[PDB]
Amino acid sequence: DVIFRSKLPDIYIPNHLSLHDYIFQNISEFATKPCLINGPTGHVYTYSDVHVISRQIAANFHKLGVNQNDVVMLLLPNCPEFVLSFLAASFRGATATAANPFFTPAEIAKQAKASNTKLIITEARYVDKIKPLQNDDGVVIVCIDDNESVPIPEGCLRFTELTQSTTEASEVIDSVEISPDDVVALPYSSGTTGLPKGVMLTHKGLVTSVAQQVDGENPNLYFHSDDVILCVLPMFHIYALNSIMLCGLRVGAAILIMPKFEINLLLELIQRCKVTVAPMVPPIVLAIAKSSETEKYDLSSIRVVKSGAAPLGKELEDAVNAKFPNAKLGQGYGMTEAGPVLAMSLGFAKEPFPVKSGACGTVVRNAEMKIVDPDTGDSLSRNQPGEICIRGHQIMKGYLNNPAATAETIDKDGWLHTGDIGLIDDDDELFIVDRLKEASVEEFRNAQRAKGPATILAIGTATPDHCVYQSDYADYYFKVTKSEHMTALKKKFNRICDKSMIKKRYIHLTEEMLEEHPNIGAYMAPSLNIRQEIITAEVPKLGKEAALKALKEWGQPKSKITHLVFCTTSGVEMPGADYKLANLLGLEPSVRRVMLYHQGCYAGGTVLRTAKDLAENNAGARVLVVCSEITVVTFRGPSEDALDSLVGQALFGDGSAAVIVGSDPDISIERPLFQLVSAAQTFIPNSAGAIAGNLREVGLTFHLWPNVPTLISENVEKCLTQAFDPLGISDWNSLFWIAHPGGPAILDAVEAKLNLDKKKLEATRHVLSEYGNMSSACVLFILDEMRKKSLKGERATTGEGLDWGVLFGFGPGLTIETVVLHSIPMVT
Amino acid sequence: DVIFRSKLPDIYIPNHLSLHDYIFQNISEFATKPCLINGPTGHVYTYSDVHVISRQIAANFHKLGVNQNDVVMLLLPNCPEFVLSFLAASFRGATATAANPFFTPAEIAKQAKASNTKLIITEARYVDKIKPLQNDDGVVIVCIDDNESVPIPEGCLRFTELTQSTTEASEVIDSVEISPDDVVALPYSSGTTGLPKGVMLTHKGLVTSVAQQVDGENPNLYFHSDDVILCVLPMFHIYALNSIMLCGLRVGAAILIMPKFEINLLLELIQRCKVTVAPMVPPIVLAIAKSSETEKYDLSSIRVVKSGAAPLGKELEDAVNAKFPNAKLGQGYGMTEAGPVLAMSLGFAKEPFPVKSGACGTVVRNAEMKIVDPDTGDSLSRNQPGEICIRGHQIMKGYLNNPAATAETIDKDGWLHTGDIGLIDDDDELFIVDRLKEASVEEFRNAQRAKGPATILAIGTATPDHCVYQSDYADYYFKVTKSEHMTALKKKFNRICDKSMIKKRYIHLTEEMLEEHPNIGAYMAPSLNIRQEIITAEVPKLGKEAALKALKEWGQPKSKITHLVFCTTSGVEMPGADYKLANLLGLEPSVRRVMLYHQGCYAGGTVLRTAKDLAENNAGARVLVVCSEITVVTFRGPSEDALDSLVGQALFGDGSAAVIVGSDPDISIERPLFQLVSAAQTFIPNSAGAIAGNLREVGLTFHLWPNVPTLISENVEKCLTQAFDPLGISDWNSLFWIAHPGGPAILDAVEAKLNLDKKKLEATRHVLSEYGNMSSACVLFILDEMRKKSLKGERATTGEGLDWGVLFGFGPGLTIETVVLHSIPMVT
């Protein structure tokens, strides 16, 4: 078997006739029955109507300068006007091309120029896309809009002007010359290769493929004249044209025109107009099958559901069978070059043949079809895949003005090569299989993050050189504040300084400075300006000193520092201390900063919490963290009233600490000290105002509740379970401890509450004893001490020999900062 | 082949003799030659010395209450004293156990009690570990320390006291009863199963295994009496004892005692003492082979390198062969229960046999060995793996006071089951194969992070209800500031307000407030206190209003908010605006806060940059970001001097915006608006002081350089390439734009510089025109506008139809914030 044929006999095809003479050959039988129904509005043209009007329109096509064998273009959605214009083009001997109204002035202008369009039938809304071709190219424009009170763009004709009677153009009933090979329809293709080409379909051709379909005693595709054929598919597409319009007309059927598809409108029109034949697409059948709307409308009238250009998945076919028991289903197989039709399901025939699912139907009659091996001319046999070829009078004359591709796709023997591939089984059904054919957010984000836990690489500390010992402090303070007159109060401050558990403290503020700026020593006198002048200059310098120690320990280049977190209690100004420190150190201006101003004693945790996330989320990010505290912000004379301020004056001292935090340590030069595992914050309820401060014209004033130690002790345990429960640790004496030494009273409270071994808070208490309360910097100093003592004493980890640790900050508003640490093993 | 034997004949073994009578049988031949050499110090005991002293020590062992068949314990490193004491124990008829000095009082006390130790020989430094047993258990203690000017713990005897001559104890030359089955050595084992057991090795036994090794005309292990045998292995371990001490002594060899191993000391002692036989361990041979030290010392004297309890990897064996050409290598196979020796390499024999690499040697002579199938009693044959059993007089008498395990490990027929497995090849060499045997930081960290890019879920905005229009503002301002007298200046402010491109602005500060607080309106009068009172109350409230809109849009529970970032220009106080807002909203107290105070107009970028990292690094983290600006901080009267302050008074207005930022949006209710891709910051050089402000007793004062627009325009392009080069985008008109509308002049400058389409800054300029300059909140408002207009106009993305975007903040110190955004597709 080299050559394949239809299972139906050859029929007589009168292809010597002009398309309109053939389509309408039988019109006397159909004359008064409905031909075109415009579904939405209900308008009906009859067969007589269509014939008469189409002829008059040809006649006036002449008047407008359209002559035999020059082209007319149709830019329209489905509508009666489309059919009338096409037929008219044929009656004239002229040629009809169509385009999608939803194209662009570019595609459309291109097609119109390629085809030599001498005129265009469109709606009003599309006229601007074709403006160029109307103005400079002289193309005549016609609008189908029938509303006489709404004007149309100037230079445009009402379609109603072409339906007008003039008998003198009807002496052009001719030509008595109209030839089988004359071109009638000129559709455009996606193409066998690339760029869209004009397909020339002739009178002989179309007459042939229509007869192939609907003609015979047993038609391949059976249409009665009592059928109502739905045409919701685009008429610009050759499928709709041929297999709906031309065929429908030839048989005397009603054609139900839907300008636009919507599922409910479709169901409505089916029930109302009793549509018997529904050509559709897969998206449409899907929509029908999915919707629960079907149960309402009576659909029993549809006897044929034909898929053109679309294959059902056999999930659908079942859905359909349910929704339409009376419907037979099937697919044609089209190609524009092929005329369009090649195979038609024989299930559609008047006396129907068996069909298999997934089949494209059988090749049409009065045609031959072969299956070649690609790149060889050899013909294959049944069930052997291969490029599908067809030959018969119904195929295209050729590509317009392109004999190159015309000879490339239609070979010397007359075979049109589709460029598709398929096989034909024993039952003569044809199956399609294939065609000639055979940095993002998700990544960027994972590239950008960093792999490991944030670790502390280096620590450094700095103090003012001015140092004052507690043994001396009550005296010194009542001296330099010119308060010596209040003896009752100095006697109390003495006790406070003794119970304070502080030995020495390093303090920038000096007696000389108070001689020069007595308003600072005054209990309340406006000091703010001078304090600000002093601390805005000093805080960055002290910060630099510490940052420099840390950077020296770390040993890598400053340019490798990617982030700078700077905490200080006051000295607000802009640009701030972050800018200033970054210029002192000569960091890259591209360093990303966080300026923490007015945070409190808890900020020690805060900066670590801040650096963790910065380091962990940025590849190769190294984070320089600097806390720098100066007490000139906070210093003031005594009053018998505010005892809280007095306690403060005994506890607070100046100091600075700097930490370098990163992820994924190289381990060539870097030495991990601790790991930041989890970081947590909470505030306690009804404690706002327990640790608290206000920036006033007298400087920063601060306040303490007597109950702070108790308030902390209450919540510490909850903080702990909250942080360590995920790690399965209940035993808190197994953790190495770092607590903000807010005051000895807080420490005593906590240890008594959790029953900590007397030695857990040893490092903390050391830092308090030697340096005082440095606010945020404190816990940093303590880490330093811890690791130093752990090294100095040859212990298994940097954590006092133990694996896990906790770091607490405590602050006003009773914000509590809970950081979980992992020690690091030492080589001992 | 059920039973396996040595390739050497059976020899005569005189096991009827006591161990000391056997070892020293031949001493007349050796009497004056060196027996023990203490390597580090050079002291030499001779054979006569050792014999005589050991006997006297037995004699005084009696005086101390040690009687036949009761136990003596040796806690010591390698030293002459160890050998002398062991022999003494044997001479007495007593029994000797040893332990590691490096054990703990627990292990040691346990072993001493288990064994019925009636006395202990140790160094001084270990005496505290045995204090209990000296005091309450009555155990006699002896220290080997010879330094007479340094005392030893009280109740302790000098070892030199046991070497003293007393003839009356020598009437105990006896017993004339000392029996083959009497126990002499009592070492402890890791055990065949679990808990450590005492192994009873008898006189018969040890005499047997020593003869098995060194006796014969062709000894399994060949030692001359001119040999010098290194004993750096622990003498408490039975291997060292048997195969070094006992064997060495039997043959008349010198024994070089190393108390401690160090590689150089070892090489030194080899070269000096001309060590011929070096029993070692794998770690030691490794160390030798690795070190480049060997080339210095003459090692040619070592003729035998014997690995006991360790197998070489044949990488080593080569290293050795190089370092010691003259050395033959081999391994014994020991087990404590086995006496210790089972197999010995026959390469060691006087007339040596062929040996294969990886072999454990051949089973010893006067013994039999079988290979059983485990859990069956069946005997295997050559090259068939199986549990190794041995039988002969050299195996243990049994486990002390444990007939259970004694019968479990030594069966009825007399076979000791090792509990190891191996095979014996055709050549009679034995091979060992096996034994009876057959939540972290890395995770927690990946569990804890969040998968996707930070996205904006919701936005909300709030303003004060008081609104003032620019058309009215010059008048209003000179009115309420009681400045109407300066006409020249009002005329200039008019121009400034006109060129300002602002239409209206929303402003908390009202005329009434200035009637009540004229110091605010005064150009410079102390205002700080009152301003602070007003903004500390207002900023959180306005913030709440906006945060509430955003939270309503988002639609999920407040409890799901995990982080709060709060930016405001001033109003510093503690607890701060973050605390206050968090209580207003009723957020969880465990919400993690960032309080950004005194940041500037750039902080718009800053908060986004801050939230990105917070959201991206925390699983299920949802971040509430609130910027809230009030101009009562910044408001003041005019002066002919500071024009910069005047410009400010025309541009700045109050406002608040709130954003919700998270990673991994659910997509059930959540609706992503933008994505935060990259966030960058930089400062420009020599621009500190171009945008700048200082908090004084008069309120916040601010300053502007005329050149700010130019300074920004210079660096904007660099910022862009820096951010977008990784994304391969050169075309900036393809980005949707958000710029801080610092002033119209800045905008004009930027667009002119990059040549932006007139419409890129449209949204930005709208927000400026409607709201003024809200500082940090501005860019937030702009995003809101952008997405709203993009939706309102049905565009492909939330980004004005475009995929990628840029957000700029600009601030004092010329810090510039560059955020890269990705739009989000809209369903249109």
Write the DSSP assignment of B350-364 as a string of letters.
SSPPP--TT---EE-
Contacts of A748 (CB under 8 A, 6+ apart): A709
Closest CA relative to residue B232, chosen from B335, B307, B323, B293? B307
| Cα–Cα dist B729/A639, whole Å | 65
| Residue B728, phi-psi category: left (phi > 0), alpha (psi -120 to 50), beta (remainder) | left
Q: What is the DSSP string of B124-167?
A: STTTTTSHHHHHTS--EEEE----TTS---TTEEEGGGTSS--S
Say if CB B658 and CB B626 are below 8 A apart: yes
CB contact under 8 A, B678 and A448: yes
**Which of B441, B529, B693 is closest, CB to CB, to A822?**
B441
Helix axes B708-724, B744-754, angle to 10 degrees: 50
If you count residue pairs, one on A and one on B, with CB atoms under 8 Å apart, how many are there? 177
| Cα–Cα dist B652/B639, whole Å | 17
In angstroms, the separation between the Cα of residue A450 and the nearest Cα of chain B is 10
Distance between alpha carbon B540 and the CA centroid of its chain, in Å?
45
Q: Which ranges of B324-469 would DSSP assign to H, the alpha helix?
A: 403-409, 441-448
In angstroms, the separation between the Cα of residue B600 and the nearest Cα of chain A is 7
The three-class DSSP label of residue B184 is strand
Q: List for chain B the helix, strand, coil content (%; round to 5).
A: 35, 25, 40
The three-class DSSP label of residue B553 is helix
Closest CA relative to residue B598, chosen from A116, A261, A579, A817? A579
Give the number of other CB atoms < 10 A from CB of residue A709.
21
Q: Is residue B328 part of an annotated ligand binding site?
A: no
Cα→Cα distances A168→A63, A66, A90, A131, A165, Å: 10, 15, 19, 31, 9
Chain B residue nearest residue A702, CA to CA: B574
Q: Indicate the pairing of strand B699-704 with strand B563-568.
A: unpaired
- Chain B residues in contact with A608 by the CB 8 A cut-off are none
N residues, chain B: 828
Q: Is residue B434 part of an annotated ligand binding site?
A: no
- Chain A residues in contact with B822 by the CB 8 A cut-off are 441
Contacts of A698 (CB under 8 A, 6+ apart): A524, A525, A526, A527, A528, A636
Q: Which ranges of B190-235 would DSSP assign to H, the alpha helix?
A: 203-214
Closest CA relative to residue A603, chosen from A302, A376, A815? A815
| Residue B35: active-site member | no
Q: Which helix (H) or strand (E) holds B685?
A: none
Residue B38 carries which side chain, given as an amino acid letter?
Answer: N
Residues B585 and B448 in one domain: yes
Q: CA geometry: angle at B91 spanning B89 and B93, to 5°?
A: 70
Q: Which helix (H) or strand (E) holds B615?
A: helix B603-616
- Chain B residues in contact with A677 by the CB 8 A cut-off are 441, 444
Q: Which helix (H) or strand (E) holds A816?
A: strand A815-822
Token pair belonging to A515: 């001689």
Contacts of A722 (CB under 8 A, 6+ apart): A680, A818, B590
Residue B540, burial from CB neighbour count under 10 angstroms (0-12, 13-18, 19+): buried
Residue A347 carries which side chain, given as an amino acid letter?
Answer: G
Q: What is the DSSP string of A678-715?
A: EEEEEE-TT-TTSEEEEEETTEEEEEE-TTHHHHHHHH
Asked if B590 reaches chain A (Cβ–Cβ under 8 Å), the answer is yes
CA atoms B6, B10, B12, B14: torsion sign: positive
Cα→Cα distances A688→A716, A812, B566, B578, B704, Å: 17, 7, 18, 12, 38
Residues B424 and B330 in one domain: yes
CB contact under 8 A, A682 and B616: no
CB contact under 8 A, A722 and B590: yes
| Cα–Cα dist A627/A642, whole Å | 28
Contacts of A384 (CB under 8 A, 6+ apart): A371, A423
| Cα–Cα dist A388/A409, whole Å | 12
Of the residues B143, B601, B719, B778, which is catalytic? Answer: B601
Say if CB B152 and CB B143 are below 8 A apart: yes
Residue B291, burial from CB neighbour count under 10 angstroms (0-12, 13-18, 19+): middle
Residues B5 and B72 in one domain: yes
Give the number of other CB atoms < 10 A from CB of residue A371.
25
Residues A347 and A281 in one domain: yes
In angstroms, the separation between the Cα of residue A445 and the nearest Cα of chain B is 6
Q: What is the DSSP string of B793-816?
A: TT-SBTTTT-SEEEEEEE-GGGEE
- Chain B residues in contact with A696 by the CB 8 A cut-off are 528-529, 532
N residues, chain A: 828
Q: Which of B672, B687, B713 is the last residue of a domain?
A: B672
- Chain B residues in contact with A612 by the CB 8 A cut-off are 617
Contacts of A675 (CB under 8 A, 6+ apart): A453, A454, A455, A456, A821, A822, A823, A824, B441
Residue A663, burial from CB neighbour count under 10 angstroms (0-12, 13-18, 19+): buried
Closest CA relative to residue A602, chosen from A363, A808, A336? A808
Say if CB A278 and CB A238 are below 8 A apart: no
Residues A500 and A479 in one domain: yes
Residues A446 and A332 in one domain: no
Say if CB A254 and CB A227 are below 8 A apart: yes
Residues A456 and A422 in one domain: no
Q: Indicate the pairing of strand A328-331 with strand A333-334.
A: unpaired
Closest CA relative to residue A53, chosen from A43, A41, A40? A43
| Residue B772, phi-psi category: left (phi > 0), alpha (psi -120 to 50), beta (remainder) | left
Return the residues preceding each gap in chain B, C–N over 2.5 A, or none: 438
Token pair belonging to A422: 């398929």
Chain B residue nearest residue A563, CA to CA: B681
Q: How many domains does chain B have?
A: 3
Residues B642 and B699 in one domain: no
Residue A655 carries which side chain, given as an amino acid letter?
Answer: G
| Cα–Cα dist A339/A184, whole Å | 12
Distance between alpha carbon B603 and the CA centroid of its chain, in Å?
39
Q: Which of B375, B404, B438 is the last residue of a domain?
A: B438
| Cα–Cα dist A663/A623, whole Å | 9
Cα→Cα distances B498→A781, B490, B504, B650, B764, Å: 56, 12, 12, 9, 18
Q: CA geometry: angle at B491 spanning B489 and B496, to 5°?
A: 90
Residues A428 and A444 in one domain: no
Chain B residue nearest residue A597, CA to CA: B597
In angstroms, the separation between the Cα of residue A818 and the nearest Cα of chain B is 11
Of the residues A601, A627, A719, A778, which is catalytic? Answer: A601
Q: Which ranges of B170-290 would DSSP assign to H, the alpha helix?
A: 203-214, 238-239, 247-251, 263-273, 282-290
Residue of B613, B634, B696, B803 to mutate, interface with A, max A Cβ within 10 Å? B613
Q: CA geometry: angle at A69 spanning A64 and A75, to 5°?
A: 60
| Cα–Cα dist B480/B472, whole Å | 12
Residues A168 and A216 in one domain: yes
Q: List for chain A the helix, strand, coil content (%; round to 5).
A: 35, 25, 40
Chain A residue nearest residue B693, CA to CA: A574
Give the number of other CB atoms < 10 A from CB of residue A574.
27
A288-297 long-range Cβ contacts below 8 angstroms, 24+ apart: A288/A263, A288/A319, A288/A320, A288/A323, A289/A316, A289/A319, A289/A320, A289/A323, A291/A263, A293/A263, A293/A264, A293/A267, A294/A267, A294/A323, A296/A267, A297/A267, A297/A268, A297/A270, A297/A271
Token pair belonging to B424: 């014996």
- Read off φ and ψ for residue B178, nearest 5 degrees: -145, 130
The three-class DSSP label of residue A256 is strand
Tell me if the bond preceding B453 is cis, omega within 30° of 0.
Answer: no
Give the number of other CB atoms < 10 A from CB of residue A407.
12
Contacts of A168 (CB under 8 A, 6+ apart): none
Q: How many helices (H) and strands (E) does chain B have?
A: 26, 36
Q: Indicate the pairing of strand A573-574 with strand B691-696.
A: antiparallel
Residues A424 and A469 in one domain: no
- Chain A residues in contact with B616 by the CB 8 A cut-off are 445, 449, 617
Q: CA geometry: angle at B91 spanning B90 and B97, to 5°?
A: 25
Contacts of B550 (CB under 8 A, 6+ apart): B458, B459, B460, B624, B658, B659, B660
Asked if B468 reaches chain A (Cβ–Cβ under 8 Å), the answer is no
| Cα–Cα dist A229/A255, whole Å | 5
Extract the annotated binding site of A for (E)-4-coumaroyl-AMP.
Answer: 239, 243, 309, 331-332, 336, 344, 437
Q: Indicate the pairing of strand A44-46 with strand A34-38.
A: antiparallel
Say if CB A346 and CB A332 are below 8 A apart: no
A contact residues 784-813, partner B, Cβ 8 Å cutoff: 811-813
Residue of A529, A534, A612, A683 to mutate, interface with B, max B Cβ within 10 Å? A683
Q: What is the CATH number of the domain that holds B716?
A: 3.40.47.10
Q: Is residue B239 part of an annotated ligand binding site?
A: yes
| Cα–Cα dist A79/A95, whole Å | 19
| Cα–Cα dist A723/B442, whole Å | 18
Distance between alpha carbon B705 and the CA centroid of its chain, in Å?
53
Quickly tell me which residue has 């040809």 as its tokens. A58
| Cα–Cα dist B73/B185, whole Å | 10
Q: Indicate the pairing of strand B655-662 with strand B622-629.
A: antiparallel
In angstroms, the separation between the Cα of residue A749 and the nearest Cα of chain B is 22
Token pair belonging to B797: 């993305």
Q: What is the DSSP string of A513-558?
A: HHHH-HHHHSSSS--HHHHHHHHHHHHHHHHHHHHHHHHHHH-S-G
Residue of A565, A574, A581 to mutate, interface with B, max B Cβ within 10 Å? A574
**Which of B445, B681, B685 is closest, CB to CB, to A593?**
B681
CB contact under 8 A, B441 and A449: no
Q: What is the DSSP string of A139-200?
A: -EEEE----TTS---TTEEEGGGTSS--SGGGGGS--S---TTSEEE--B---SSSS--BEE
Q: Which of B381, B404, B438 is the last residue of a domain?
A: B438
- Chain B residues in contact with A722 by the CB 8 A cut-off are 590
**Which of A582, A618, A813 is closest, CB to CB, to B574?**
A813
The three-class DSSP label of residue A42 is coil
- The resolution of the experimental structure, rounded to one decimal in Å, is 3.1
Asked if B678 reaches chain A (Cβ–Cβ under 8 Å), the answer is yes
- Chain A residues in contact with B566 by the CB 8 A cut-off are none
CB contact under 8 A, A616 and B617: yes
Asked if B521 reaches chain A (Cβ–Cβ under 8 Å), the answer is no
Asked if A452 reaches chain B (Cβ–Cβ under 8 Å), the answer is yes
Instruction: Name the DSSP letter for residue A661.
Output: E
**Which of B677, B682, B694 is closest, CB to CB, to A573?**
B694
Q: CA geometry: angle at B707 spanning B705 and B711, to 5°?
A: 115
Say if CB A345 and CB A331 are below 8 A apart: yes
Domain that holds residue A745: 673-828
| Cα–Cα dist B425/A665, whole Å | 52
Token pair belonging to A610: 């801040």
Residues A346 and A443 in one domain: no
| Cα–Cα dist B177/B179, whole Å | 6
Q: What is the CATH number of the domain that holds B410?
A: 3.40.50.12780
| Cα–Cα dist A493/A504, whole Å | 16
Say if CB B98 and CB B73 are below 8 A apart: yes
| Cα–Cα dist A575/A571, whole Å | 11
Asked if A574 reaches chain B (Cβ–Cβ under 8 Å), the answer is yes
In angstroms, the separation between the Cα of residue A701 and the nearest Cα of chain B is 10
In angstroms, the separation between the Cα of residue A15 and the nearest Cα of chain B is 49
| Cα–Cα dist B421/B446, whole Å | 44
| Cα–Cα dist B95/B34, whole Å | 26
| Cα–Cα dist B154/A214, whole Å | 127
Residue A715, burial from CB neighbour count under 10 angstroms (0-12, 13-18, 19+): buried
Token pair belonging to A442: 């998700």
CB contact under 8 A, A813 and B579: yes
Rg of chain B taking only CA atoms, in angstroms: 47
Q: Indicate the pairing of strand A156-158 with strand A140-143.
A: parallel
Instruction: Please state how this structure was obtained.
Output: X-ray
